[PDB]
C-alpha cells in the first residue's frame, strides 16, 4: 500500500479584523496531527505521531509553525491591500512528501485561491499555473525575494519530511497493518415503482479502506448494484451503502456478497 | 556527525579536479558544506547543498545517491586554486552550534 | 568590510600580555572564535549564540570571551596558554543554511 503524508491549512479572512487559520495532517487514512486557530501547538492525535523525532526538535518545529501562522495572516493581509482584492477571501495549502524506498521521493506544495489554484513550489522557487490570473505575477515575484522562506521551504520539503515519513511507519507499524471485519444487513428504503422494489445491503465497520460489495442472483453478478460514497465511522471505520432496483418478482432469491482484506477467505454473504 | 577526506591530493593545472568526502553516518536534515583556505587568509564558503546536485561559477557539488559520500569538483583548476579544502556537516535544525572543522584536504597545483 | 579584525600583526612580550578584536558589520547572532598554527586545523575557543550568551570550546582552556554586544566579541589571551603564539580567526553566523563568514585573522607572536 501507499502512506503518503498531507498536511493541508485552511486560512480563511472574512473582513479587515476577523480571520482564523486552522490545520491537520493525515497518514494515509488515518489522521495524525490537529492544529487549531486557539490552540497555541500543533496536537499529536497518536501515541506515535511523534515518529522519532527528539523532543527538542519536536519542539523548534513547533516554533516554526507558530512564526508561520502569524507572517501567513500578515502577509496575506499585505497582498490584499497592494493589488486591491475584496475580502472575502478563502487561502487553501496542501503540501506534504512520500517516500519510496526505490529512491523518488515525491515532494508538493500547492496554494488555492477561492477553489482555484494560482500557484506552487516546483524546484527552488514559486510558480504561477497558466490559468492564474495576471495580479498573481505580482505577488509571486516578491515572495521570490525572501530567500529565507525559500531555503526553509526546500529543508522541510527535501528533508525533514522524508526523514518524518519513515519515522511514522516505524512507530506506527502495528496500528496500520491493523484489520478490522464488517457486519452487513438489508433493509428496504426509496421504492422506485409500485411493482419495483429497491433492496438496501449495508456493510459498516472496515478498518482497511479498499473493499468490494455487490448484489448477485446465488453468483451471477449482477450489474443493477451501484454502490454510494465511502463514508466516515467515528471509529476511524468506514461505512458503505448498497443499491439494486428490481421489480418483486425478479426480487427472491438474491444476495449481497462482500469480500474485505480482514475477512480470510470467506465473504459474507446475505439472502433474502 | 562527522566527515572523512584524504590528506593530500595534487593537480596539474588547466584540469578539472575531484576532491572526495565521506560521511557514511549522515541524516536526511543534515546540510553538507564546503570550505577553503589559502596559506596566510582566513577561510571562505564555497558551495553548499542537501539533496540534489549544485552548479556555481567555478565549482559543483556531486552528491552520491546514497547519500553516504561525497565530491566537491573544480572546473578549471589554476595555480591559485592550491589551498586547503574542509567538508563539513551542518545541521538543518540548528541544535548544536559546536561548529568544529575537521583537517580537511590540501591540495597541490603542479605547473 | 564584512569582519575587521586588527591589526595584521601584534607582538607584545610574556606577561605583558592582550585582549583583541573582531567587529562586525552586518548583523548576525552568533560569533566563534577559531586558532590555526603552522600545518594545522582550525580548533574552536569559544562561540556564542546572541548577546550575554558564550559556551566553551575544546580549547578554551587559558582564554576568555565576552559579548556585550552583537558588534564585539573580544578574546584576552593573558590567562596563561600553553603556547600564545598563533594565528586566530574570527568568524559569523546566518540562519539556514547557517553559512559561516571569516574575518582576516591577527597573528600574533610573543617571545617566551
Known amino acids: 500500500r501507499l502512506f503518503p503524508l498531507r498536511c493541508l491549512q485552511i486560512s480563511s479572512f472574512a473582513n479587515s479584523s476577523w480571520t482564523r487559520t486552522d490545520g491537520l495532517a493525515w497518514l494515509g487514512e488515518l489522521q495524525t496531527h490537529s492544529w487549531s486557530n486557539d490552540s497555541d501547538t500543533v496536537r499529536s492525535l497518536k501515541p506515535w505521531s511523534q515518529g522519532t523525532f527528539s523532543d527538542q526538535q519536536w519542539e523548534t518545529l513547533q516554533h516554526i509553525f507558530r512564526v508561520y501562522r502569524s507572517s501567513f495572516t500578515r502577509d496575506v493581509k499585505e497582498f490584499a491591500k497592494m493589488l486591491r482584492l475584496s475580502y472575502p477571501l478563502e487561502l487553501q495549502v496542501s503540501a506534504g512528501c512520500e517516500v519510496h524506498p526505490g529512491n523518488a521521493s515525491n515532494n508538493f506544495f500547492h496554494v488555492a485561491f477561492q477553489g482555484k489554484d494560482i500557484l506552487s513550489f516546483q524546484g527552488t522557487s514559486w510558480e504561477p499555473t497558466q490559468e492564474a490570473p495576471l495580479w498573481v505575477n505580482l505577488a509571486i515575484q516578491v515572495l521570490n525575494q525572501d530567500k529565507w522562506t525559500r531555503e526553509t521551504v526546500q529543508w522541510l520539503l527535501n528533508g525533514t519530511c522524508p526523514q518524518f515519513v519513515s519515522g511514522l511507519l516505524e512507530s506506527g507499524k502495528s496500528e496500520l497493518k491493523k484489520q478490522v471485519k464488517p457486519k452487513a444487513w438489508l433493509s428496504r428504503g426509496p421504492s422506485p415503482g409500485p411493482g419495483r422494489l429497491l433492496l438496501v445491503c449495508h456493510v459498516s465497520g472496515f478498518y482497511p479502506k479498499p473493499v468490494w460489495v455487490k448484489w448477485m442472483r446465488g453468483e451471477q453478478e449482477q450489474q443493477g448494484t451501484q454502490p454510494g460514497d465511502i463514508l466516515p465511522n467515528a471509529d476511524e471505520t468506514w461505512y458503505l451503502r448498497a443499491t439494486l432496483d428490481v421489480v418483486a418478482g425478479e426480487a427472491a432469491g438474491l444476495s449481497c456478497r462482500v469480500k474485505h482484506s480482514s475477512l480470510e477467505g470467506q465473504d459474507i454473504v446475505l439472502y433474502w | 556527525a562527522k566527515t572523512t577526506q584524504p590528506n593530500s591530493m595534487e593537480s596539474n593545472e588547466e584540469e578539472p579536479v575531484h576532491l572526495p568526502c565521506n560521511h557514511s553516518t549522515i541524516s536526511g536534515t543534515d546540510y553538507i558544506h564546503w570550505y577553503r583556505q589559502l596559506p596566510s587568509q582566513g577561510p571562505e564558503y564555497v558551495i553548499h547543498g542537501l539533496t540534489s546536485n549544485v552548479n556555481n561559477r567555478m565549482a559543483s557539488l556531486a552528491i552520491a545517491e546514497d547519500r553516504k559520500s561525497s565530491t566537491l569538483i573544480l572546473h578549471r583548476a589554476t595555480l591559485r586554486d592550491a589551498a586547503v579544502y574542509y567538508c563539513?556537516?551542518?545541521?538543518?535544525?540548528?541544535?548544536?552550534?559546536?561548529?568544529?572543522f575537521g583537517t580537511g584536504t590540501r591540495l597541490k597545483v603542479l605547473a | 568590510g564584512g569582519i575587521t579584525q586588527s591589526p595584521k600583526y601584534l607582538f607584545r612580550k610574556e606577561g605583558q600580555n592582550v585582549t583583541l578584536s573582531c567587529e562586525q558589520n552586518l548583523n548576525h547572532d552568533a560569533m566563534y572564535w577559531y586558532r590555526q598554527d603552522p600545518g594545522q586545523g582550525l580548533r574552536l575557543i569559544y562561540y556564542?549564540?546572541?548577546?550575554?550568551?558564550?559556551q566553551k570550546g575544546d580549547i578554551a582552556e587559558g582564554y576568555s570571551v565576552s559579548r556585550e554586544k552583537k558588534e564585539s566579541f573580544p578574546l584576552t589571551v593573558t590567562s596563561a596558554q600553553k603556547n600564545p603564539t598563533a594565528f586566530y580567526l574570527c568568524?559569523?553566523?546566518?540562519?539556514?543554511?547557517?553559512?559561516?563568514?571569516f574575518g582576516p585573522g591577527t597573528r600574533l607572536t610573543v617571545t617566551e
Open positions: 563539513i556537516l551542518r545541521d538543518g535544525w540548528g541544535g548544536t552550534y559546536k561548529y568544529i
Open positions: 556564542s549564540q546572541i548577546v550575554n550568551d558564550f
Open positions: 568568524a559569523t553566523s546566518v540562519g539556514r543554511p547557517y553559512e559561516q563568514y
